[model samples]
Target: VEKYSLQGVVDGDKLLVVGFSEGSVNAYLYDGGETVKLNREPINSVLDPHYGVGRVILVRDVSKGAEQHALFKVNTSRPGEEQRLEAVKPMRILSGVDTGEAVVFTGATEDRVALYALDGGGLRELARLPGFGFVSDIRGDLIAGLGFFGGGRVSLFTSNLSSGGLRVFDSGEGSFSSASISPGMKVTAGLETAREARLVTVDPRDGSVEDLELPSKDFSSYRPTAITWLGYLPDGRLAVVARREGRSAVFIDGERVEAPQGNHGRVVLWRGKLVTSHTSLSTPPRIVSLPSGEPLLEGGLPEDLRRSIAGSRLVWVESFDGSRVPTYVLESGRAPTPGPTVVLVHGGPFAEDSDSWDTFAASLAAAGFHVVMPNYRGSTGYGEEWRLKIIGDPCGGELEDVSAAARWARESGLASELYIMGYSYGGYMTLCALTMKPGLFKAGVAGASVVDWEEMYELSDAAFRNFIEQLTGGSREIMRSRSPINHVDRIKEPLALIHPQNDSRTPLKPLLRLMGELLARGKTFEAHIIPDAGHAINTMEDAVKILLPAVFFLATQRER
Candidate 1:
């Protein structure tokens, strides 16, 4: 079956990997052995052990079951006897010192990081610190916290666990994405500006802050994403996996080390070496160790299917304000002359599409369609300012960037009959581009795409509504103006709307309006509402049922 492995903690000689698979999260001994199922329900977050043999916390939202996302502690300290937890609501889980103790955010809405020890086999909160939000590492006596004000403003702070002293690290501007503490106790926080990304290091002890200079490698320039990973080498130098362009680049200290072409799926400090689940456009995902650079584990893709995979290169398309929108061009075998070309936009106007290994893109290329995956203005790995530009102009500036990429495709002879395909935010962009640009595309495939922002704002879950507010400046008028339901009559291309029936983020009721409009106008489109599924369509069974059919639909469009 499929294994979705993420964070890890070292317990004795075994590397305890914690991640969800199918419907539950389990701890797989990463060196290939038996797995211990930690949570029966789906888990969203897992924290690494600070300093212990086998103790970690997992978070699962219990809106449907437990009322809140609670922390379930799985500790194997007791020999042979299995002792677990019923899970408690926590806003944050930090790496603390004591063996059975955890630093977490609890209490009422004014949740703050505090020292909590398991009293009588259950947690009893001791003392609360002044820290109110999430930050970086909690090493020794110091901890960093990240706070977000409205309208993209962010503040970075440090809390002293010893004295309960809270101090502001940065006055807070732009957006502070993520931060991690080095083995040397140095704190690195990734910050986003308008046109570029900068890594700032804050030493809480000395109150000194400096910009970390990364080595300039290929492609004139590259930017890191908000999230980055920092691990320690045997030599004590730090190992970094930062996003350059769209993919990840390995860095020793501040120097960028060349990785084997493609993008990194996940990188972790396993044992004493740096190991990553790496993949490229043509290469299947394989867990490989760094420096030595060989596969520790590889996926089982048949040689024929593996050989059919296409290679892609990153290209920069210029937008109106002179932003170089990066796009990936994947071409395997020869395509038919002036044939079907698919422009695949990634979801998460906030997230980015890297040059990483994508089976769907490769499969589409193998099916003889030229594909263009564009990193528009709203995408990460650019800069904070670029991401913020889309807040007030969600459908305006970012849509123009996609339109520019489409023009680049046509001018470069990559597209003759253009088809747009996307999921989530990308799906929303697909519908927006198709309806707004009218004659630009022949067909579209949208998965979990939003139809009406106003309705979505009103109907979506609290977390998703907050995300919507973050993107659209929380304006109902802006949401209405940017919605595709308001422009369904302008749509020229046939669309395949794929959605999960139980979608909480992008609900199905508002989409019925689009369906009704298309039906009333006798428009050509298809809808697939999957039963009992959520937002993500990651299953292999789904690829056969949904993805292949959508590709076939795009293929047969020219004849229609």
Candidate 2:
């Protein structure tokens, strides 16, 4: 009924080890029976061996102070073997390499990179390496990470083990968003300048740096694409996962390849066949065979759900700044008549709406309502310029694009009565839209929402605080100006606010601020908070329980 969030996958000679969210792992025989479940919690890293036995590692909360990570050696080929990892305290799983011995990167703190090895008994800390900005990567014994400078410069550090211990390689040219070490022990980092993503590839051997160029033609639709993962193919070609709009593409030898269309992509070569995991707006997660990009669909969507699944198409809405903002329109295949539209906004201004199937959009379409997923400015998959458009301006530019989407929806007669709904960043955008242009929607819903950016910046973690500072240009005036709470007095539309009480990202403060503002204004608004729920409710039952009300709210709009 609900899709499983598959985290990482590794290939074994006899079995395939797949890691899922909440410390869970499933090991399936290469050509055999039911998958063997390994953990009850979330899993971080896995090493599926080709010639030797497979290994699994996961993270869990042991009802103590902080959550800890543990490693397990399993005979995935022979399902029934089991054992437990008895560890003392907190250890973070950074990265793992399965070069026969199965080495893992564990950290007590972000600044401390601890390399651990999985021997026959259990995991043991091998060596301690220097770390920075919580950015780290390991392949063989070579370790690479990003070191932060006090003045905002983040430099890359790569080192390897020598007879004398850790031998420093490159402590050079900084990164903007991400840093990674490929399987070939190549170092890659991304830096954005003037809204363009510039990547620096470093050869750890001689400290040689190469600047990669991105294909750019359409200034309106294409900009600089951000690199998500960097790798070297077995054939010695540069393999990269790059973001363009809300979906990812496989780039080989500095050129984008026709791989597949999805919000995310994970490519691996096993037994001469390239494997990838992809999901789109109408399709659930499936293991995809690359080159041909055909999906093996035995355990995919059930027969009934497949029939019920809606179709999605991409449409472009011209923003006020003459930008081609993309949106996905989803509806039932058999439906001839236009239905009530729910404009769904995706969270993570840094993230984008993918072509991969969204259960939320599917649920609305199955209920006979049209769903509109808009990729406004600040969303990924588009070029770096579009993402930068919202940096200092924040909600202003993004709000304009969504406004353009709403106008297009109305003008196109796609919606009889439009309702807007979103979670986190999308939720914040919903609140802003409801106030900026009042009565634009029949009703609105915001979940895990933010109303006050200033409050959020202070309450959030160091990384998020840094992100806020970067976006707001380190100005308190812009932070306050960008917050939706300041404009709530102008809102006349009915609004419903939902949040998980335990969410540290959005937290309770901003939701409370919005609630108080709504109540003081005597505005029509409903509030719901799940007691033990975090930022994202994991289970389908809990998610449905919370989101079902939004459907009911939209259903009421049909009558009104």
Candidate 3:
């Protein structure tokens, strides 16, 4: 699994990809069965390039884990040669696109978040966004993006590249999930409602929107719970990726294109064939040909390691409020039915545990522990209402959903002992469970966790400050009460703390205070603070440093 190739973007006949080469994540150009390395160091991602663009923009964080990324341009013909873009200041780049002639991007600095364009005239501020924003697609003089300005709901925004005018469109129906500019010069987007997701086209001139219908009756009949991604192919055909429960399906020109069983990334037309990224619980992320499901580019997994995962399935666990939580369970072939199991929590309170490749879950299964991942109430892929329930009420209903998953694992005769592990918000859940519902698990591992919401909020950047306000409903009392740091004395289980010392999203300052509190209370705990790393890890060494300690701690706890 070490030697791996994950598909990135398709540029003309060449497909840009990220692969593990020289023990680090590096950009590569995969064309006609040949792979060429593009960068010397690990990179975060490649900016979307025009179809026939000869050069690709590589975004890399030079600040260790501080997320101050700098852009470098590498010509496809030149391979490892790179030219730095010193004109653009280093910032937390969210998303961008390179049209070969103009470069447009969205980035966040300490004071503000904005959209900027770089071309012959130099870097120009196109617009100042209220919160976090992403440049989705660029067509002609129109630039489309999604922003989280109005509370937590997403608003579709468009700005003119020539005139520098910005306009935002908010739907009374729901939040805009994905957006792309169509060939007809209109903004096409995926609108996520309370129950279902649908497609619409917006007239950027007058802010009028109309429903968009595709040629595939099968997709309409499928009633997808959420739209994962959508874009127009090079041949002017529309491609859509939608999901229900935990799996996703790909549709091209309204026709359901047969893809792998689990989930797929963005669909792209490459060399007269449709290609997309595919992944599942058992399969790591790889580029596969549509319809045939043949591996175009992938990492090789040994038979012994592949067989370590017996099987994976989805289950509905009933929460305390009678809400059914969508949970994915991976059974370890080496572990017994009534055996040690880990309730692996996903980080995003807004993210879901789908049928996707998870290194942490796979690692746990290899270590002879069954893995249980619960898509709690605040998780997406279920619906907007379920996701919004966690707002202003962190650790309230969602924690109950997590607790329900643990109980289900034991009551269903699948677990003899329970343990918990998570990173980011998942790490926050680990602390919440240990402090609020003591003895539910033997021990817990919290990685890059949130300890004091108030302190962390004050320490966060503009984008994160807005995010915390939205999550906590902008209430100081809610932030203080829902924080697990306030109730540390109630923790009864052994805990392991793992953190990135330079993590910007979930700062490490609060975690340091948490250690002092745990020590004062005579709690049994261990901590590992990774050096020169942030919440976003690009190198394999940093990943091992953050993950290995948690696994070791869990293994030691199981032995006891």
Indicate the TM-score of model 1.
Answer: 0.81
Q: Mark the 10 consecutive residues where model 3 has the least summed lDDT.
A: 2-11
Task: Point out where model 3 deviates above 4 Å.
Answer: 2-11
Model 1 over residues 165-274: C-alpha lDDT tens digits? 55555534456665656665667766655545567677777756677655543211444544445544435555566676766777666666666776663455666676
What lDDT tens digits, residue by residue, belong to model 2 across residues 295-346? 5322346654545545666799988988888988886543334557788888
What is the C-alpha lDDT profile of model 3 across 245-340, one tens digit per residue? Answer: 889988876788888988886776678788888888778778888889997877876776667888888899999999999998988888999799
Residue 548, candidate 1: Cα error in Å is 4.3
Check candidate 1 and list the clashing pairs.
134-146, 193-385, 347-426
The residue-level lDDT of candidate 1 at 299 comes to 48
Candidate RMSDs in Å, in order, are 5.0, 5.7, 1.6
Please estimate how well model 2 matches the true structure, expressed as its whole-model Cα lDDT: 0.61
Using Cα atoms with residue i matched to residue i, what is each candidate's TM-score against the true structure? 0.81, 0.77, 0.97
